[model samples]
Target chain A: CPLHWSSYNGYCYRVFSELKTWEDAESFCYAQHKGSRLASIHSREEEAFVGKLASQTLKYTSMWLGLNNAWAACKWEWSDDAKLDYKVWLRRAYCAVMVVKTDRIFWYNRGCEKTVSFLCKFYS
Target chain B: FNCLPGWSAYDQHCYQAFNEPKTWDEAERFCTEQAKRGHLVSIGSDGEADFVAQLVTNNIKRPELYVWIGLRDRRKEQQCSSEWSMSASIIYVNWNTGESQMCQGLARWTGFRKWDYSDCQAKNPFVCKFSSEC
Candidate 1:
């Protein structure tokens, strides 16, 4: 079944539990799957889909989506390689894994050991 | 004659040598006090315990000598009294089955959670400290 949402298009992804660091995770996605990290959200539909998955799997902690400063020129790159043309800040924050107190739509950075649910991306 | 930077010549890994035996609480404090740091133990994430565990298992000339880690599950009522968390947050992934049960009150808190609380009084080799500068 579908696990995560795709931003470039309306593609769905799965949730897998292969433990690895961010660098390792990127390599794993590239080798095994067509897409890596979680796709960047483009529409409300995709956001809702990802939100549901995050809520279902991670109730107490945060999960890592497929985005890092490794790809392209941007510090943050989405899984689908789609440009983050629009800036929708959950709060006025830029770092990942920040607290939810701010009114921005950014991701939180956390220690890898802390077990949290994750989202994978699919191309087709 | 200083060693290389970013590397210690004599096997650069986390190590704390405990000379005397003490209660779990005392042990924790002793480790912290000795090192002027918190209870010295590796978190479960960084292969820290496994790395040390392997070193101990391989190096100890005497088979009877055992090594200690910084993992503990406070399920055992007695041990839970001093647990840092309200609920026993299993830190280390490697744990002996049913070792955290109430009956297993003697498990030493390894700052990690793999070792069982089978014997609280059993004296064995152990590590102590809270943090590493490196």
Candidate 2:
């Protein structure tokens, strides 16, 4: 009941309804969300939880994650430099997206300039 | 029934370069009308990119020649996404720095390969890819 933010696993997550490019989304998260960055999915449960929220909120649109290849070639790093422990990359674009379709929810790489809805994660 | 005369085969597809200059949309139309089940060539992997790059290197006579492929930005179409003209999923990309915008075209820069964003109306040679077996 925190209006736009939801508590999840000792963190606060918010899915922005407006669309922005991957860079703009990350900048928005950091600048507007109290230093929060794009959401980084660490485990299966986190992926599932975020997937469910994305399904409910965004329906079928892909949402940007913090994972990007700005630092190196094909090396996706989170905005916060969290461990690149878990991955489900289906393509090789520079930016990663949490794709929420009708039957499947997974990660895919898309162009960083593509405008899409995005998720932001904040420390609790 | 094979890939015409000059087309080369790789990864289950036939590819050919056309030296005739055309705009991006015009090139897409040319491929659709000319090649077998063709749209513009859609690159899916690093291997595919290398193959195309090799083809360009072998056939191109000048360093300034850029070729139109199948990728374009759909933001003006209200989709706000860049996608292949043939509807292939975007799996791999080899863009130069800050080049992901509008319509994308491939160019050979020095000893490297890079994709660049160009206005859709710019005229350039293009490559076409299709699957055909004799």
Candidate 3:
């Protein structure tokens, strides 16, 4: 972990509840450090952990994720260049959103331009 | 159920909050008669009430004012009313700072839904709820 960032598994993570467009959120995460980028989840444990991170900091339904399919037709990639092995979707749109329901959390997609809170992560 | 245009879906209902002011009765009337079988947004729980307030505030276009809900004094008791859509159930109430005080309910949406009382005929903006037509 690094200065206010929480360490989980092998990465340092942070949740940002301030609303921003997916592009702007990516930019903000990059501005933090050269190695930093929007957070990615490769497993269910990581996804739930990130959702808990957001719910504790602020109560919101939808938050931006690093995954996006806009670069190519049906091609999705993480901003941090993590392996795209696991994903949850409630109908994938142009960009990804992690929806935090009270009972559980899952990934949903929305337009990239829509302003929303997001999470960021980097190697610890 | 599909909401009409200008209605936002939450859970299973579609809602629209009018910046347009009208008396409590008139607001209820607008929801039912004018808005195609809608109701003055009836709240079933605290969370429902809170979300309903947010719905109105978000639609209010940067404004802070008490909005009418689907509740009024009936037989000396505060009761929910929705002639054509909602039920007369009374599972939740949010009186401001005290117990029941008015004939009608007004909601102030800062974040949580802290209710206030107002004259039934006093004009104010209100929220309406709807669902897909059967």
Name the candidate that leads on lDDT. Answer: 2
C-alpha DockQ of every model: 0.02, 0.05, 0.01
**Candidate 1 per-residue C-alpha lDDT over B1-134 given as tens digits, one digit per residue, 9 for 90 to 100:** 23223212223333544456554445554655552444534433344534544444444432434333333333223332222111223231211224332112212233222433345454555554233345
Q: What's each prediction's TM-score?
A: 0.30, 0.45, 0.40
Q: Model 3, range B1-134, lDDT digits (tens) per residue?
A: 66677888776778887778988768877877765666776655455657766677777764677766555433113222211011223332211123332444555655565556567778788777776645
The 10 consecutive residues of candidate 2 chain B with the worst lDDT sum are: B75-84
- Which stretch of 10 consecutive residues in model 2 chain A shows the poorest summed lDDT? A73-82
Cα lDDT, model 3, residue A46: 70
* Model 2 C-alpha lDDT per residue in residues B1-134, reported as the tens digit of each score: 45678988775688888878888778887877874776776665556766877886678764656777566543223232434322323443323234434566777776545676678889888888787555
* A4-29 per-residue lDDT for model 3 (tens digits): 67878678888766788877887788
Q: Per candidate, chain B TM-score?
A: 0.46, 0.74, 0.70
After superposition, the stretches of candidate 3 with alpha carbons farther than 4 Å from their true spots are A1-124, B76-101
Candidate number achieving the greatest TM-score relative to the actual structure:
2
Better of 1 and 2 by DockQ: 2
DockQ of 3: 0.01
| Candidate 2 deviant stretches above 4 angstroms | A1-124, B78-101
Instruction: Give the alpha carbon lDDT tens digit for every residue of A1-124 in model 2.
Output: 2586777757777777888887788677776555466776656666666666766676566677665443221211101121221112233345656654455465566788889888877666
Model 1 iRMS (Å) reads 21.2
Q: Highest DockQ, which number? A: 2
* Deviation from native of the Cα of residue B28 in model 2, angstroms: 0.6
